[PDB]
């Protein structure tokens, strides 16, 4: 569907000069922060430099998450990109520091390569020997391509997969020999006229040619957190999905770091360093910063990019204030990129992009009035007015939206600048910090 960051298709800079284009790939209307984020993106794609800190500071509704999603769309589905929010760390299951350690180790991909052995061909006969009331199984599978005619054997798991798949005579199946999955591709004969509970006639494929035992080289990418969970527990796997991981001791991490270094040297694995994005870091207390400053000290730390909103705020868990709510022993390590509020000739084209994304057609008078509203209430009210005016124009059966639809939507739904006045007018029928009356 159409979320609030679906129009963005990357960061929109040059590849040779990385100059900020004034209108390219959604992120339209800002030049300094997009150029600096392009430099950060290039030193992430280099992968050499480890353990930095980028702080995208600025007023709200200025496109900070938009720049973050622009870097996310620009890396593709290769490099990990954790979209961590700062309130998720405060768990009750695990400690507050170990949640940060997992959040760092989720953003270091390990890309390994392994050889599987796939089969191909037409099943000629199945032969299954079963015991009575519990016991082992025996299996002989005769399979034929256009060239070879093999009679393979089977174990218990292969028969448990065959009966799960219901592989009859005359099926084009492909068995991965290593993993042990069975995917029926279709049939070569037709459906028999002797049995009732047979099934559905599948796709008509011919007999495959070539060889039986073919080899394949697959590439598997796991984060370090998955390696930590599968090597921290004897039988309790799958806890890396259902979040049941209590604590991983340090003896496990100091062995997995060494084994990943050995896999890096052997040419088995490759370390792909990633991005940890922390949205609204001002909610973390000082007990988190006293670990974040020291986890950025090793070869396995991701390049942290994080946002903020606040001016001189007080740091949680303390008694004193600081710029951005972050301590001044942590603000030495970071590098702060500022963002600026917008200009109306940029708000016009941003609302034009948001209107063309949600498939809404406009008139220039309505767009001028909409820009006039967006000057005084931000983009977050104007985009909602776009969608609302689309549906009100759909209610009265109009092709394009007009001035009257925007005025209707402005009359119905208040911007916060009028809701503050609505609070400040009737203070006697709203619960403040005190009592309230009823007429």
């Amino acid at each position: 569907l159409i979320a609030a960051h679906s129009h963005i298709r990357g960061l929109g800079v040059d590849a040779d000069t990385l100059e900020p284009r004034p209108s390219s790939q959604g992120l339209v209307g800002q030049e300094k922060a997009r150029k600096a984020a392009a430099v950060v993106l290039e030193m992430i794609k280099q992968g050499k430099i480890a353990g930095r800190a980028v702080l995208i500071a600025g007023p709200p509704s200025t496109g900070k998450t938009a720049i973050a999603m622009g870097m996310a769309q620009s890396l593709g589905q290769d490099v990990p990109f954790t979209t961590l929010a700062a309130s998720e760390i405060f768990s009750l299951e695990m400690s507050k520091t170990e949640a940060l350690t997992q959040a760092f180790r989720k953003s270091i991909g390990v890309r390994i390569k392994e050889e599987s052995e796939i089969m191909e061909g037409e099943v000629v006969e199945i032969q299954i020997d079963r015991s009575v009331t519990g016991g082992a199984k025996q299996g002989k599978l005769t399979i034929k391509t256009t060239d070879m005619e093999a009679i393979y054997d089977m174990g218990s798991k292969m028969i448990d997969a065959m009966t799960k798949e219901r592989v009859m005579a005359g099926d084009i199946i492909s068995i991965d020999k290593s993993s042990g999955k069975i995917t029926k591709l279709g049939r070569s004969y037709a459906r028999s006229r002797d049995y009732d509970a047979m099934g559905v006639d599948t796709k008509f494929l011919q007999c495959p040619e070539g060889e039986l035992q073919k080899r394949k080289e697959v590439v598997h990418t796991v984060s370090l957190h998955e390696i930590d969970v599968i090597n921290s527990r004897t039988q309790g796997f799958l806890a890396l999905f259902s979040g049941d991981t209590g604590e991983i001791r340090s003896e496990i991490r100091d062995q997995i770091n060494t084994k990943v270094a050995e896999w890096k040297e052997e040419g088995k694995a490759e370390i792909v360093p990633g991005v940890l994005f922390i949205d609204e870091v001002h909610m973390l207390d000082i007990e988190c910063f006293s670990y974040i400053n020291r986890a950025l000290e090793s070869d396995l730390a991701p390049i942290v990019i994080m946002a903020s909103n606040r001016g001189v705020s007080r740091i949680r868990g303390t008694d004193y204030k600081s710029p951005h709510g972050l301590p001044l022993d942590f603000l030495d390590r970071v590098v702060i990129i500022n963002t600026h509020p917008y200009t109306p000739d940029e708000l016009r084209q941003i609302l034009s992009i948001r209107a063309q994304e949600e498939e809404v057609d406009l008139t220039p008078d309505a767009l001028a009035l909409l820009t006039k509203i967006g000057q005084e209430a931000g983009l977050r009210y104007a985009s909602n007015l776009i969608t609302t005016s689309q549906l009100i124009a759909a209610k009265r059966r109009a092709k394009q939206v007009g001035v009257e639809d925007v005025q209707r939507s402005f009359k119905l739904f208040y911007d916060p600048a009028r809701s503050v006045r609505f609070v400040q007018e009737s203070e006697k029928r709203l619960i403040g910090n005190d009592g309230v009356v009823d007429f």
Binding site: T133, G134, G135, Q235, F237, L238, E266, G267, K268
Partner: protein
């Protein structure tokens, strides 16, 4: 480590240890039925139940190393710890797929051994002749290689 036990010097302590720390009801319930019980339940005239109706051990979720901690080197790291061996692997795969038959010569019989392994892993048929190989055995081996084309490397 094994779990801590109690050194109490009565017979009852030993009986309670072998009835709690081992407790054969749970072991029978976990691993499954005795094959004698399977025979008396599957040759009888009427169907009868089993107190472990199937093996209630959970399936381990890691195929190569289940329920232990005892690992061993990996022929993988073997074939890559030697640059020659790594390059021989590529070449033997291509040779095999071509239907070529190889004499493969070494200056060290210790290496002949290491390799012998590797060939077992990649499951190629081979013979061996070295200075340890007795004379009529020599005749025999060479004759094989020459009689029976299944053998890929000598």
């Amino acid at each position: 480590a094994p779990p801590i036990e109690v050194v109490c010097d009565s017979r009852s302590a030993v009986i309670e240890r072998e009835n709690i720390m081992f407790h054969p009801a749970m072991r029978k319930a976990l691993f499954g039925p005795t094959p004698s019980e399977i025979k008396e339940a599957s040759f009888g005239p009427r169907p009868v139940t089993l107190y472990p109706p199937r093996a209630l051990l959970p399936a381990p979720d890691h195929d190569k190393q289940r329920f232990t901690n005892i690992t061993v080197p990996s022929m993988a790291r073997f074939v890559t710890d030697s640059g020659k061996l790594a390059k021989l692997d590529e070449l033997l795969r291509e040779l095999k797929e071509g239907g070529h038959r190889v004499l493969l010569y070494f200056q060290m019989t210790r290496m002949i051994d290491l390799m012998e392994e590797y060939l077992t892993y990649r499951n190629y048929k081979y013979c061996r002749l070295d200075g340890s190989t007795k004379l009529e055995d020599r005749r025999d081996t060479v004759a094989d290689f020459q009689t029976r084309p299944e053998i890929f490397i000598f």
